[PDB]
Amino acid sequence: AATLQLGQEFQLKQINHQGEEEELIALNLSEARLVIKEALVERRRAFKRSQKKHKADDDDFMHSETREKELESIDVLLEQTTGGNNKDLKNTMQYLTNFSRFRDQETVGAVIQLLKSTGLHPFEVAQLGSLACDTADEAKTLIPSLNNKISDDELERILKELSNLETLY
Amino acid sequence: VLTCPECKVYPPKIVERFSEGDVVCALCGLVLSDK
Amino acid sequence: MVGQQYSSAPLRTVKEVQFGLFSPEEVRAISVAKIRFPETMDETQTRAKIGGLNDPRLGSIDRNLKCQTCQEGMNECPGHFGHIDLAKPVFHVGFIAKIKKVCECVCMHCGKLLLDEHNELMRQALAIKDSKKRFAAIWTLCKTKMVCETDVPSEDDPTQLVSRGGCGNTQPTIRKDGLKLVGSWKKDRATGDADEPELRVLSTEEILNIFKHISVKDFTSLGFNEVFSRPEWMILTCLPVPPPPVRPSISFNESQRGEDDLTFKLADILKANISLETLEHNGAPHHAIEEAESLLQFHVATYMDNDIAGQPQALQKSGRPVKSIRARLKGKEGRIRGNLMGKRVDFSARTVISGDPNLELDQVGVPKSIAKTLTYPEVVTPYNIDRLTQLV
Amino acid sequence: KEKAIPKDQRATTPYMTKYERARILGTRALQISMNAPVFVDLEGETDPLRIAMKELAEKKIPLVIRRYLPDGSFEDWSVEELIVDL
Amino acid sequence: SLHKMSMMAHRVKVIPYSTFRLNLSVTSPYNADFDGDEMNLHVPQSEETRAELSQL
Amino acid sequence: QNAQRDAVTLFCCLLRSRLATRRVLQEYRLTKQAFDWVLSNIEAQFLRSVVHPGEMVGVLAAQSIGEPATQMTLNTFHFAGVASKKVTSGVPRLKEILNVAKNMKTPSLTVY
Amino acid sequence: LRMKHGTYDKLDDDGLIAPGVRVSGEDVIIGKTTPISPDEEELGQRTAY
Amino acid sequence: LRFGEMERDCMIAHGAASFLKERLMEASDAFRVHICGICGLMTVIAKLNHNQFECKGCDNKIDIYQIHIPYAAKLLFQELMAMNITPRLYTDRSRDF
Amino acid sequence: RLVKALEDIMVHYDNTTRNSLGNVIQFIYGEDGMDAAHIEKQSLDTIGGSDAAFEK
Amino acid sequence: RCSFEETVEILFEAGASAELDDCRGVSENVILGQMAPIGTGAFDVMIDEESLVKY
Amino acid sequence: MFFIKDLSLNITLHPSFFGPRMKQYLKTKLLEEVEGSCTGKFGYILCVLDYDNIDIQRGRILPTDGSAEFNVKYRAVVFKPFKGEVVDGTVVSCSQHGFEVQVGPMKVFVTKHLMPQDLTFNAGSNPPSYQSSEDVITIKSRIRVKIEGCISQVSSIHAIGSIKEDYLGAI
């Protein structure tokens, strides 16, 4: 999408099941990983509630000490919620976990606020949330849409602030 | 080449049933090709 | 459960059948093998010649090798289309009458309709939605205007003449002789020449050029369509070649292949085409070119319909007429009335009857062997597995 | 969903035709022969068609017939509320 | 098959010998006698088809 | 409503014809129980005579008309037994009716 | 190759059955063999012998 | 045995569509054909082992449909198309595209 | 020719009689909407007879 | 219409005029091997969830 | 690229599952068939939202086999790139012709003609990699690839990208 050619299937204006126009929603690695983790843990909780109906521990999964412990919790979650029949989901989740720029929800919200305060395109915002660039020109070349649309000083400020926001591992 | 996927015997033994339009393995009775 | 295979394409049901016509662009794009040679199988007499009538890219009917294009057996390959390029355009035997009728209704030079909105009769004709009656009325009205009018009286005032851009030339009178369309120019008596209509055989390329110049409003007015049914397409330039499923070869033995009539006719078509091409580039006299074009037109015309009125019938080497495509469909035993409305079936029997006063009213006695041959697919369930096991 | 007629404005016959009866019996017999659950007290029967008739007798077939008007609209009638002549 | 009543359903009974058997009162709708007439038998292959032959 | 009354007019006429008071009390001598039974049975047997939606009436009509047309050939020439009555009827007349021929064999006109 | 399912046993050495043998369904009574040129192959069906 | 036109008319008179459909297609000649969703033709090339579906003329690899039709209908359509006529099969929900 | 001409006529749920295009051939089948096999010959007693017999 | 006695000419004319067929008559559903709306085929059978759950 | 879309599917339920618990079987079928799939029209099917809010439609019993077909609509998060897209990813395998980069669930290949000559192939290194004056790219090295084209099949989508211009390579 160098020229923002998203096609009909991925138009900026989306028609939902309610028939009202909505802005197209784009999520980076951190947002998508958090959303899928939340959905999986909610589904696990629903499954446990259903099993209790037919017939505490969940706080430790979301709060992970380390990357390896997070990966182990992810494997347990996939075993208990997915069944192990979906390898592509495991690969995507591993790719999200290994290269997640931001682990905490508040920091991800800060990144979202910083990127979308200027009102840029959701594609550019998600790309900036996915890519960490040292210089504004590096991002502008690697994101041709950002060219001619954002001042270099603003892009440099955003990139430096995002680099500062990265939580040390 | 036409071989039975269950007997796995080479060379395959095959009988054609013309009056039924079938090709049948002569060991497991499996039907290979019809019409 | 048809095909003995699995595919991920969704099942659907046919709702509409939109007819139309090929453009030469479509014939070119669809085709996968430009047929080039008048031969089918190689000089080794073991494999088909590549680029011939039996090119492997079209498909195979035999049960051993698979199609080169899709790598599927003969029970799954539908068949793919070739195409043949013609030196000069040829009339399609099924639209000669419509071509002539639409030719007489349009100026031969400016390429426009002889009438316009000013006339009331044109308003009446353009008020009709039925295309057939509309075209019939427009033809029977405009067949008699041999001169294009440059100026027309205005509707608001008959004394005011408005120019419609007409060329003002004189249109001929067209007649049909065999496969040829011959025009006669009746020169105006004021020119000083005698009332002798000069005769000339109209060239197909000129008529094609005239038809290509017609506009969209005239497209709708005549009764054609912009997308599917342009009139320029009524004149052939490229001929599609049907896959071998349509013309299956019957092989008695390994080297005994009796080919279908359709492939023989197609081979003759290509032979005539290459002969005309090699005479075209050799600087031959015009008479030979005209004769070769006539022969090509004859072959292409009798390839589709072999019962044309007022012409000899294209015969086979044994003297029998060549079965064209039309004779395949028109008969009582043809496709429509012999393979699509009624057809032979499975799981059936036929036998003489007799009388039995001990049988009930709605009960039929079935012989033992006929009962041993026909079957029924019963499904194994908890209620029948014992009896079904004993049956097996 | 504009085509559907409200239940109050239903103007079709409240009896069920012979064609609808034959279609319903065939569908139910097929489903029973494909090991579907039976909603009635089977008593010594081993034929799916007869069990289909038995279920029809107590009006326990859980199916709905959609009737197509010529314009395109349709009318929905449950098998329970259709009068069957005997 | 000139009219509707020339194609009807029946229940089978397996018998010896090579002929079909009919009750002597259905020979009027079929316009058939027993001096050499042959008739045709078609077998359904499903439950819906069997129900159609039995209820229509 | 108008269509339905128009449909049931003649049957209502027959029903009024048969169930007149004098006919009931003097010709049939029905009691109250038998009268109720008759009314209920009449309504029930009427309600089961309507045509079932889905019936292919076109092929039924075509078969009904064209089956006797096959046997019509035999007795067409009975009017051939009268030489002075050479008027087309039978197979040729039906053929001419179906073709909507513009030149009949024997046109005629009857004036009162 | 392409032998028929009928019983060839009743045939004599001459390839012709002899009078007085109860033939039945799908049996063969005349044995006919066709030589084939080596360049003719049944699309891989034919073997070396 | 021939299941002619008179038999078809009698079965229509009775009103048994399912028997007619089973006799016509499942008992004589059933065929599965892939058709293009844009031009509505039978030109789609399908490699079933690799499930590769391609329409060469229209450059289509997504909108491709499976249809169950007799074999004589396919022959008729091909013979119609061999004379420069286009029987273009369409689907119920193809008007959205 | 007869059967081919009429083959596409069907009684609908509106009680009308139409064809494949939707054109109405009859606004009611038979003008009373009755099956052809539920109809017997009956005599209307009001038509005939003299006025004296009717009055009595 | 092409079913009887003028097949090829009607096909030619339909092609030349770009005629649209609707596939609702008996012959069009017999050619395409489908279920015509004829008697038992005049309606659709659907599952009622309410009664099924009620049991 | 991650996006939220509205999807629908037709699911056939076997007659043997016709009971009061049909909704549970439909939900299990949907979850087991849809999640993790790939569709060329919408890319890989990553996840489905609002599992409790699954929309359902009335059954329509097929006239041929008795299996009930249902139409199910939902909202899903999916991944699909576009021409000219630039994405970060992880090097999978190293070859002389170029390299392969995993991005999300997909693979984008780059041919040696699509990088500047400053990046030279080193085979003696363990593992073999591409070495330049400033950027070194190897296994588990974050690399930005500008995707140029994509090929879509039934079950997967492959991609081909180029890094021929500046500001590409190791980050």
GROMACS .gro file of C-alpha atoms in nm, chain D residues 19-20 23-24 27 39 59-60 62-68 78 80, chain J residues 24 35 38-49 51-52 55:
model
   34
  615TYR     CA    1  -4.773  -3.216  -0.227
  616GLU     CA    2  -4.667  -3.060   0.104
  619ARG     CA    3  -4.253  -3.359   0.072
  620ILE     CA    4  -4.268  -3.351   0.453
  623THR     CA    5  -3.777  -3.528   0.429
  635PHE     CA    6  -3.959  -3.745   1.899
  655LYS     CA    7  -4.814  -3.337   1.522
  656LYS     CA    8  -4.453  -3.339   1.642
  658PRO     CA    9  -4.047  -2.958   1.388
  659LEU     CA   10  -4.055  -2.821   1.032
  660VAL     CA   11  -4.186  -2.503   0.869
  661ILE     CA   12  -4.323  -2.467   0.515
  662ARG     CA   13  -4.249  -2.147   0.323
  663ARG     CA   14  -4.506  -2.068   0.053
  664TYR     CA   15  -4.399  -1.848  -0.239
  674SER     CA   16  -4.556  -2.442   1.091
  676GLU     CA   17  -4.805  -2.809   1.378
 1076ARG     CA   18  -3.804  -2.042  -1.452
 1087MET     CA   19  -3.556  -2.906  -0.944
 1090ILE     CA   20  -4.369  -2.816  -0.996
 1091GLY     CA   21  -4.600  -2.934  -0.721
 1092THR     CA   22  -4.375  -3.066  -0.445
 1093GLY     CA   23  -4.116  -2.814  -0.568
 1094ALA     CA   24  -4.338  -2.507  -0.526
 1095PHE     CA   25  -4.226  -2.437  -0.166
 1096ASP     CA   26  -3.927  -2.457   0.069
 1097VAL     CA   27  -3.885  -2.672   0.380
 1098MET     CA   28  -3.718  -2.498   0.674
 1099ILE     CA   29  -3.633  -2.584   1.034
 1100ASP     CA   30  -3.818  -2.420   1.322
 1101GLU     CA   31  -3.583  -2.361   1.615
 1103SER     CA   32  -4.035  -2.602   1.865
 1104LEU     CA   33  -3.706  -2.792   1.850
 1107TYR     CA   34  -3.883  -3.037   2.326
   0.00000   0.00000   0.00000
